[PDB]
Amino acid sequence: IAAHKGVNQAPVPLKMERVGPHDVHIEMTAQITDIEIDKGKIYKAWTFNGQAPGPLVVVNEGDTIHFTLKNMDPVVPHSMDFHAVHASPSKDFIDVMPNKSGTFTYPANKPGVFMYHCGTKPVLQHIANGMHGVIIVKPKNGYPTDKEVDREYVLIQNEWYKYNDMNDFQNGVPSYVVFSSKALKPGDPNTNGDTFTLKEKPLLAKVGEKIRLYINNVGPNEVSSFHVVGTVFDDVYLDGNPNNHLQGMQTVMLPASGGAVVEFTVTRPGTYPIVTHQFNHAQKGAVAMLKVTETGED
Amino acid sequence: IAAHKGVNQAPVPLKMERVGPHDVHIEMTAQITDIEIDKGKIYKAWTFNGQAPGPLVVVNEGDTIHFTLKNMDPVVPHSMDFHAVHASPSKDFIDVMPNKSGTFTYPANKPGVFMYHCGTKPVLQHIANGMHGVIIVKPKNGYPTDKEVDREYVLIQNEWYKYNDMNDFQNGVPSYVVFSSKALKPGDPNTNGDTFTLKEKPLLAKVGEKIRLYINNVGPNEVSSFHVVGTVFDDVYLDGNPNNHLQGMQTVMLPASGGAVVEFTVTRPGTYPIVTHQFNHAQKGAVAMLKVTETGED
Amino acid sequence: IAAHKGVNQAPVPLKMERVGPHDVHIEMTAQITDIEIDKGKIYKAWTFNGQAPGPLVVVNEGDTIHFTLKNMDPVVPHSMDFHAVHASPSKDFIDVMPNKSGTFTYPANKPGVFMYHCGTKPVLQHIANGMHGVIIVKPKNGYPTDKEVDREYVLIQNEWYKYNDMNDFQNGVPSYVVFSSKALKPGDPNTNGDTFTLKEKPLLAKVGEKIRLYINNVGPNEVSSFHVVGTVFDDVYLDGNPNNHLQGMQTVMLPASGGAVVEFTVTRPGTYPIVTHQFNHAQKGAVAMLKVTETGED
Ligand SMILES: [Cu+2]
Ligand SMILES: [Cu+2]
Ligand SMILES: [Cu+2]
Ligand SMILES: [Cu+2]
Ligand SMILES: [Cu+2]
Ligand SMILES: [Cu+2]
Ligand SMILES: [Cu+2]
Ligand SMILES: [Cu+2]
Ligand SMILES: [Cu+2]
Ligand SMILES: [Cu+2]
Ligand SMILES: [Cu+2]
Ligand SMILES: [Cu+2]
Ligand SMILES: [Cu+2]
Ligand SMILES: [Cu+2]
Ligand SMILES: [Cu+2]
Ligand SMILES: [Cu+2]
Ligand SMILES: [Cu+2]
Ligand SMILES: [Cu+2]
Ligand code: NA
Ligand code: NA
Ligand code: NA
């Protein structure tokens, strides 16, 4: 797109504030940002806020979201679809034109780990170019195993294809499949989908902890066979709904856009890979690391 | 197949009648019929009854089916495998030769949303050419959320490949992935797997309704990540068995041949896309639409 | 690998012995063995014990495994990762060099049907070359449907690609997808992943029996849509954990590395195919047969 040549819009922080006991404002951008998706490989991504996947959103079950998208792309319209919400797609997930803003309001009444993404046609193009992310909706009544959890992180799986190549997006194997982590608390890492950051700077934990991961496979195209090496998932909640309870899973199958809350115990010091067990995708980048120490520090 | 050149056998209605409190007759054809699978693209499908997927079958849990296949194909044998039934495959799902009929009897003792398909070797060829469909077996005791359901439809996902090309069937990406809808009640649409009909003539509902979809991904080859935009599934029953109960799912993973009953609420007027969230497949046709109005009429 | 040319190390029996009420010794080899994966097609597999998938391991929930790997490969290091155990990957799933042995100890505290595989980088290469298998951990309290089961077998699904071709492993479709069966009791078959053995010598059962299959799809890359023709799964336990209970499933979706215990009834004499319902994979070998007779004998 000639109007994207030489464009690299610096990342813009997510803005969020609570405006009532059950109402939250969220303001995001759609913007064009260069991201290093593998060593030496820049992708001029279509993004929310200059991150791909986009910034983490966390709200409470029952919150209505008053969402504003400010479209900084000079030429392509963009939009937002949160899987968390009940909305009219043709009124509430509609396009915002270049250099304009749009505000849409809708409730998040279901707990879980939901994908969000741009919903502008062709949606495959918008998602594959980087416009995907996760919104977590915290359950009003928690999860039954909350009291056992020592530490938590968010991981997202996505693919990258040949740059803005619709043929490849439709018909080609991914070039890269990757994990990123999005921060829940101060100090947690906040990374983009790339082949290397979570290898070189693993997530950290301490021997003996029960870890919770909030996970989503945003695709665009692949399913995920999510596995943590060296452990078994004690508890799994499909899509993050507390009802959807499995136990003792080695591997959790995620559809494209599928989420889960998974919990596992790390019993011994060392480094624990985190994969999709579709090992062609792991080989193409989808391995993160969890470093487990006697103190929880590096 | 030289004997199929210029053949286009007009669709034949399904014939079904109940012959006892727990016994039902079903008569289908195997026939060769031209179907427009994308605009300008005719596929000379191998079909049951001139539909691909084939006609909907609905029976009650505990019904024995006395099934007759009348093979109208001039040269290729065909057969029937219902996933609903307990049967001996090598005695009861056997070939019926051209211009002959066969009758086979077997019980449907399990509630759910089951694939049916031709079982003639090579089965990949028969299924990929169009010989697939759904049989619903209604549970004796219903589903626990029956009283909440306002409106229901059936949707089926399938793929289309290069015409009768076994190499492509085994080794190639689908050319199209599509939804069709099969009628449960008078007035409901009854369509073939194509890229466009359910976009141009959406399924209809009324604001505020709880909709139930009976869904099956008949493949032949792909899994499905089934999602309705703008909503969350309140309840999901895997394979349509009431026991297999999930709640609050954004997306339901279906294996090839996998079924489900899914229920969701449409809260606002507008048009709601229905996708597989494997967006390469959505881009290649697998998007249906649900139009939600203040009255339920267009 | 020049050092593998002309090497075909004869299969070595698994050695296992119980050394305490909750402690078991297991000794395996890593070795290079020719396996006929389709008629006329030899693959010089990287294996445990000269089998691919490797030999069945069965232990009890709560057993600590004292595992020794004796690496007979003349040039490539190998390792072992059991999904059943809690272990430090970087201390306990580490490489054993050519002509050396390593012993690692770790507990299996979770019941189920777990993948094991070599964990040496690149793991895709080790798994795709044949270094995969199943360990079953028997639940202390059994499964609720134990008393109904008449006969049981183990089946494993894997793929084969172009020989030791990392490009194909990452980016290509499988050349073959196959089932094998591993013996639980004297007399049961014990086979390698190939396109034909379980067609030509089906598993055997008797009319009216409830059969249990312990299944795992070891990949490396594909998901499985596991289905037995002519029946419905009465009960399914995902990953073999008794908690994860489904009923009345036509088809069970397995992620890569995913396991299950599935149970079904065979009501009539005949031959019952067992497939992945991703029919491109079935066509490329992934069909086993179950022959059901009035006596249970051939
Ligand atoms: Cu309140
Ligand atoms: Cu507001
Ligand atoms: Cu966009
Ligand atoms: Cu979506
Ligand atoms: Cu792929
Ligand atoms: Cu703890
Ligand atoms: Cu009766
Ligand atoms: Cu009759
Ligand atoms: Cu046929
Ligand atoms: Cu089938
Ligand atoms: Cu595909
Ligand atoms: Cu209602
Ligand atoms: Cu004891
Ligand atoms: Cu010992
Ligand atoms: Cu190895
Ligand atoms: Cu593994
Ligand atoms: Cu494949
Ligand atoms: Cu019995
Ligand atoms: Na308010
Ligand atoms: Na009768
Ligand atoms: Na001991």
mmCIF file of C-alpha atoms in Angstrom, chain A residues 173-174 223-227 229-234 245-253 264-273 277-281 283-284, chain C residues 81 83-93 105 107 110 113-115 117 122-124 127 166 169-171 216 220-221 223 239 241 243-244 255-257 259:
data_model
loop_
_atom_site.group_PDB
_atom_site.id
_atom_site.type_symbol
_atom_site.label_atom_id
_atom_site.label_comp_id
_atom_site.label_asym_id
_atom_site.label_seq_id
_atom_site.Cartn_x
_atom_site.Cartn_y
_atom_site.Cartn_z
ATOM 1 C CA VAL A 173 1.466 -22.472 5.413
ATOM 2 C CA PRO A 174 2.432 -19.957 8.085
ATOM 3 C CA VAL A 223 -5.546 -24.631 15.739
ATOM 4 C CA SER A 224 -3.171 -24.993 18.721
ATOM 5 C CA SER A 225 -2.191 -28.036 20.804
ATOM 6 C CA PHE A 226 -1.042 -26.176 23.869
ATOM 7 C CA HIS A 227 1.412 -28.003 26.184
ATOM 8 C CA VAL A 229 6.813 -29.446 28.965
ATOM 9 C CA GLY A 230 7.607 -31.143 32.293
ATOM 10 C CA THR A 231 4.176 -30.725 33.806
ATOM 11 C CA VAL A 232 0.474 -31.685 33.394
ATOM 12 C CA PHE A 233 -2.396 -29.201 33.597
ATOM 13 C CA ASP A 234 -4.022 -29.724 36.999
ATOM 14 C CA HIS A 245 -13.712 -27.689 33.876
ATOM 15 C CA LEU A 246 -11.194 -30.375 32.842
ATOM 16 C CA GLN A 247 -8.485 -31.894 34.961
ATOM 17 C CA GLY A 248 -5.162 -33.593 34.364
ATOM 18 C CA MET A 249 -4.824 -32.633 30.680
ATOM 19 C CA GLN A 250 -1.430 -33.048 29.000
ATOM 20 C CA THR A 251 -2.351 -30.780 26.113
ATOM 21 C CA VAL A 252 -5.251 -28.407 25.471
ATOM 22 C CA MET A 253 -6.748 -28.166 21.971
ATOM 23 C CA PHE A 264 -0.055 -26.436 36.439
ATOM 24 C CA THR A 265 2.575 -26.987 39.061
ATOM 25 C CA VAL A 266 6.340 -26.624 38.451
ATOM 26 C CA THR A 267 8.022 -29.020 40.831
ATOM 27 C CA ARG A 268 11.745 -28.682 40.144
ATOM 28 C CA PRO A 269 14.148 -25.843 39.203
ATOM 29 C CA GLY A 270 14.941 -25.517 35.527
ATOM 30 C CA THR A 271 13.636 -24.162 32.274
ATOM 31 C CA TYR A 272 10.254 -25.429 31.066
ATOM 32 C CA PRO A 273 9.387 -24.982 27.328
ATOM 33 C CA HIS A 277 2.639 -29.569 20.126
ATOM 34 C CA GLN A 278 1.930 -29.255 16.374
ATOM 35 C CA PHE A 279 5.661 -29.348 16.054
ATOM 36 C CA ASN A 280 5.902 -27.812 12.620
ATOM 37 C CA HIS A 281 4.497 -24.644 14.242
ATOM 38 C CA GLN A 283 9.767 -25.290 14.904
ATOM 39 C CA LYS A 284 8.589 -22.107 13.131
ATOM 40 C CA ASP C 81 10.238 -36.582 27.587
ATOM 41 C CA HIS C 83 4.139 -36.209 29.220
ATOM 42 C CA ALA C 84 3.012 -38.271 32.200
ATOM 43 C CA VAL C 85 5.635 -36.898 34.599
ATOM 44 C CA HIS C 86 6.501 -33.791 36.557
ATOM 45 C CA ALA C 87 10.138 -33.062 35.814
ATOM 46 C CA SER C 88 12.601 -30.285 35.186
ATOM 47 C CA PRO C 89 12.986 -30.404 31.316
ATOM 48 C CA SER C 90 16.482 -28.842 31.457
ATOM 49 C CA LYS C 91 17.766 -31.341 34.016
ATOM 50 C CA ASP C 92 15.658 -34.485 33.506
ATOM 51 C CA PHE C 93 14.839 -34.586 29.759
ATOM 52 C CA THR C 105 13.875 -40.144 37.884
ATOM 53 C CA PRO C 107 6.925 -39.195 39.284
ATOM 54 C CA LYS C 110 -1.694 -38.174 36.955
ATOM 55 C CA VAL C 113 -2.865 -41.809 28.119
ATOM 56 C CA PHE C 114 0.237 -39.724 27.609
ATOM 57 C CA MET C 115 2.622 -39.161 24.753
ATOM 58 C CA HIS C 117 8.957 -38.630 22.729
ATOM 59 C CA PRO C 122 15.140 -29.845 16.869
ATOM 60 C CA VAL C 123 12.349 -31.777 18.508
ATOM 61 C CA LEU C 124 10.271 -31.752 15.301
ATOM 62 C CA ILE C 127 9.602 -36.860 16.621
ATOM 63 C CA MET C 166 13.214 -30.715 7.767
ATOM 64 C CA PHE C 169 8.585 -31.726 8.226
ATOM 65 C CA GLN C 170 7.887 -27.953 8.706
ATOM 66 C CA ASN C 171 6.025 -27.079 5.528
ATOM 67 C CA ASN C 216 -3.021 -41.059 21.416
ATOM 68 C CA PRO C 220 4.046 -34.649 14.977
ATOM 69 C CA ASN C 221 1.911 -32.055 13.256
ATOM 70 C CA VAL C 223 -4.808 -33.174 14.849
ATOM 71 C CA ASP C 239 -6.492 -37.590 28.099
ATOM 72 C CA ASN C 241 -8.377 -38.685 33.158
ATOM 73 C CA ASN C 243 -12.865 -36.682 35.421
ATOM 74 C CA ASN C 244 -12.990 -35.642 31.806
ATOM 75 C CA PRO C 255 -4.751 -32.349 19.532
ATOM 76 C CA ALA C 256 -1.209 -33.307 18.573
ATOM 77 C CA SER C 257 -0.026 -35.346 21.613
ATOM 78 C CA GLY C 259 -4.939 -38.893 24.313
#
